[PDB]
Amino acid sequence: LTPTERKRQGYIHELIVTEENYVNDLQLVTEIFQKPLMESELLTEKEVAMIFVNWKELIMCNIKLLKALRVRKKMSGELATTLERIEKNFVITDPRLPDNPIIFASDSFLQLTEYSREEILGRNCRFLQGPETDRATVRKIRDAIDNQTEVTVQLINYTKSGKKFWNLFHLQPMRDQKGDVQYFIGVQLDGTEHVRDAAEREGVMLIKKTAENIDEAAKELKMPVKMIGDILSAQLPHMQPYIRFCSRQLNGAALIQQKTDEAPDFKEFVKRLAMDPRCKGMPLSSFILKPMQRVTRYPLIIKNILENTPENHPDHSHLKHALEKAEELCSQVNEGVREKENSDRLEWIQAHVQCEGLSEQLVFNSVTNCLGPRKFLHSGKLYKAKSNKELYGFLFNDFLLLTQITVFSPKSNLQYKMYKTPIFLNEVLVKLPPIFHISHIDRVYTLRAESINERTAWVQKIKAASELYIETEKKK
Numbered sequence: 342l343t344p345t346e347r348k349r350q351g352y353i354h355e356l357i358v359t360e361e362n363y364v365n366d367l368q369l370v371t372e373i374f375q376k377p378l379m380e381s382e383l384l385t386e387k388e389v390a391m392i393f394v395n396w397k398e399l400i401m402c403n404i405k406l407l408k409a410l411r412v413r414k415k416m417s418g419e420l421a422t423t424l425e426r427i428e429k430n431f432v433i434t435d436p437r438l439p440d441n442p443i444i445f446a447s448d449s450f451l452q453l454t455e456y457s458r459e460e461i462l463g464r465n466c467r468f469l470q471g472p473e474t475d476r477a478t479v480r481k482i483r484d485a486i487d488n489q490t491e492v493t494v495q496l497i498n499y500t501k502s503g504k505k506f507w508n509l510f511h512l513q514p515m516r517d518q519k520g521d522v523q524y525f526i527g528v529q530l531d532g533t534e535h536v537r538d539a540a541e542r543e544g545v546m547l548i549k550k551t552a553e554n555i556d557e558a559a560k561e562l563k564m565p566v567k568m569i570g571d572i573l574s575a576q577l578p579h580m581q582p583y584i585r586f587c588s589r590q591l592n593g594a595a596l597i598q599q600k601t602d603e604a605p606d607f608k609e610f611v612k613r614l615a616m617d618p619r620c621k622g623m624p625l626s627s628f629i630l631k632p633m634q635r636v637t638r639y640p641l642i643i644k645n646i647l648e649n650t651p652e653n654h655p656d657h658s659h660l661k662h663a664l665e666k667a668e669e670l671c672s673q674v675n676e677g678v679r680e681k682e683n684s685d686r687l688e689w690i691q692a693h694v695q696c697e698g699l700s701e702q703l704v705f706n707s708v709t710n711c712l713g714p715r716k717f718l719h720s721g722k723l724y725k726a727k728s729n730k731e732l733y734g735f736l737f738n739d740f741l742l743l744t745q746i747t748v749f750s751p752k753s754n755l756q757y758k759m760y761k762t763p764i765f766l767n768e769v770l771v772k773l774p775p776i777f778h779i780s781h782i783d784r785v786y787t788l789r790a791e792s793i794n795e796r797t798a799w800v801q802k803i804k805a806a807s808e809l810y811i812e813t814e815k816k817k
């Protein structure tokens with residue numbers, strides 16, 4: 342096959358495999374960090390929500406994505422578990438991708454070579470080679486690769502610390518029905534001495550049977566993919582919860598670091614949850630960075646698929662939209678991260694303003710219907726005319742929230758109760774007769790601000806955000 346179509350399948354499966362690892366990481370934090378901390382009674386229900394935030398919703402998004410990928414790929418969840426049951430040193434590489442990168446490494450392999458998964462994936466296997474390695478043996482391996490055939494040799498490899506060990510290595514291509522090589526299987530039998538006669542004859546049989554089991558394990562993965570963009574184009578516009586999480590990931594990380602230094606009983610309980618072999622010895626504070634990494638990873642991946650997809654291909658159109666949505670999703674994420682002050686205010690409103698009786702729960706620190714990331718504009722006391730009722734209003738870029746006190750200082754806590762249904766600014770007009778008039782089509786509202794300088798701040802900000810909303814709605 343042409344290198345273009347070859348690279349195309351390589352990047353399509355780069356999307357699928359990395360998503361598998363990612364979704365797996367999300368479920369880990371919920372399993373061995375979230376649920377334990379909630380039932381540990383070490384922290385309050387409020388402190389826990391500051392860290393994970395909407396972590397649960399992040400899983401619901403990607404699981405919906407991963408499932409769609411698996412059905413198209415005719416896969417099942419078994420791949421990770423099936424591969425883990427093979428307790429041998431092995432890696433899988435992708436010859437379709439430049440420099441033949443590693444896409445998977447067994448637990449035995451990682452511990453043998455003293456490297457971590459983050460150091461390994463995406464790189465060529467030549468880091469094992471050293472000074473006392475027979476370069477003639479290496480060339481035989483390269484030839485077997487270029488000729489797309491299996492091979493079995495012995496050579497000296499090095500760990501991360503530089504420890505020497507003999508490597509009874511076996512290479513084996515992974516072919517589909519059409520015989521096209523999709524992956525390469527590399528099994529390593531570590532030893533102290535060069536094996537001969539019976540010692541060699543036994544080791545060869547094991548590492549070869551090991552390779553066959555991997556081919557069976559990766560049987561669902563090896564098949565080629567026709568289309569993948571239509572799935573990404575339908576799932577990416579539903580990656581909204583990332584905007585909230587990534588805007589609060591900084592405060593969530595600062596909470597962990599602070600609570601650790603002021604509570605020794607908390608520090609030990611966290612590390613006893615990072616013990617789990619699925620954590621690979623990385624702390625909880627390192628998992629929090631992953632959602633921000635994944636959303637910035639998507640545009641890089643999709644573009645690689647798009648660049649290796651011709652114009653006449655039916656998947657080219659969907660990949661265009663997918664790239665657009667991925668970049669739009671990524672942009673709104675970076676906007677929320679930068680506007681830190683706006684993020685603190687929206688989350689403050691979330692906790693102190695009780696909004697109930699709605700068809701859907703109100704999340705202030707989220708995306709609007711049309712304008713994107715919600716932005717707080719103005720707040721203050723508002724007195725309704727002819728009633729003079731003490732009300733407290735919150736003005737946003739998309740709607741106005743009226744409440745009643747039962748301002749943004751974290752220590753100061755006071756309760757706000759929702760007064761009426763959120764008045765959206767896509768259907769309101771504002772004129773002047775500290776009294777100002779807003780014109781809703783259905784009902785009439787006449788409010789009186791604290792002062793003259795206040796009502797001018799209301800009228801201006803409401804009108805400006807309204808006109809921006811109206812003209813945005815007129816686009817389509």
Ligand SMILES: Cc1cc2nc3c(=O)[nH]c(=O)nc-3n(C[C@H](O)[C@H](O)[C@H](O)COP(=O)(O)O)c2cc1C
Pocket residue numbers: 432433434441465466467469470479480482483486496498508510512525526527528529
């Ligand atoms: C699946 C696979 C597994 C490999 N495993 C090893 C290995 O364990 N040790 C090693 O020295 N080379 C291994 N190689 C070979 C190297 O990745 C590399 O291709 C080889 O050393 C030739 O390097 P060169 O391109 O600089 O000539 C493996 C290759 C493949 C495709």
